[PDB]
Ligand binder design. Structure first.
Ligand code: SF4
Ligand SMILES: [Mg+2]
Ligand SMILES: [Mg+2]
Length: 237
């Protein structure tokens, strides 16, 4: 009857703090994220759309056979599209890559994003999300992991576990970025631990279909388990 998702923000923030502590007990400092440098992360994200991880990595490395970022920026777009042919829609991704590189080069510094470290957090997010093919999750991940800014990336795993438990009601993934950050401290190491532990939990236990609730440390405070028991449905749209 009294679901977490309907509780006041202060109670949902305390719930999320409990979740963070329990997941850290389960996973510690285990980190399943790729931990890429910022240029690699941005370009990989552009290539990742509707593409498997193996094909994304292969397309990225084939792209790097064209040379450094300056050479990729200047290469004929068809050469870039051919190089990234393992990813879906290479003809559309090639101009996104070249435009993103052009904009990064024009920013202060070389092919780096260190200038983002000093910008106000919202301005830095907007600068990255303005890049073609780059969304708020990747912008948040780059700022958090590479630059220690207090933002919280929400991927499919974070969104699914948080929503099932009831830390937030059901909403879109972009909205969940604001909603979850509003429940969290401006503490980048804390935000990063929570992000990676959510990823571990979503991959190992709270899976997209048939989650393993009987193996889940969150079970006694999970809205989804309280509503469905051992029949929590797939996390759909
Ligand atoms: S109890 Fe089940 S649905 Fe709830 S967080 Fe754990 S695995 Fe996910
Ligand atoms: Mg530059
Ligand atoms: Mg964008």
């Amino acid at each position: 009857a009294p679901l977490n998702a309907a509780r006041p923000a202060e109670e949902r923030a305390a719930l999320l703090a409990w979740v963070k502590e329990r997941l850290h007990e389960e996973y510690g400092d285990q980190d399943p994220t790729p931990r890429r440098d910022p240029m690699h992360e941005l370009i990989s994200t552009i290539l990742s759309q509707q593409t498997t991880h193996a094909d994304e990595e292969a397309a990225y490395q084939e792209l790097r056979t064209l040379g450094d970022w300056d050479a990729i920026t200047l290469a004929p777009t068809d050469a870039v599209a051919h190089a990234i042919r393992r990813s879906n829609y290479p003809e559309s991704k090639a101009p996104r890559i070249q435009e993103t590189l052009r904009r990064i080069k024009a920013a202060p510094g070389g092919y780096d994003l260190d200038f983002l470290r000093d910008l106000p957090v919202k301005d830095a997010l907007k600068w990255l999300t303005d890049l073609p093919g780059v969304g708020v999750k990747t912008a948040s991940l780059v700022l958090l992991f590479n630059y220690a800014r207090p933002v919280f990336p929400v991927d499919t795993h974070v969104h699914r576990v948080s929503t099932r438990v009831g830390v937030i009601p059901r909403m879109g993934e972009q909205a969940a970025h604001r909603a979850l950050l509003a429940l969290l401290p401006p503490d980048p190491p804390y935000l990063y631990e929570l992000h990676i532990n959510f990823l571990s939990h979503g991959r190992q236990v709270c899976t997209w279909t048939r989650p393993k609730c009987g193996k889940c440390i969150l079970r006694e405070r999970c809205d989804a388990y309280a509503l469905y028991g051992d029949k929590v449905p797939s996390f759909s749209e």
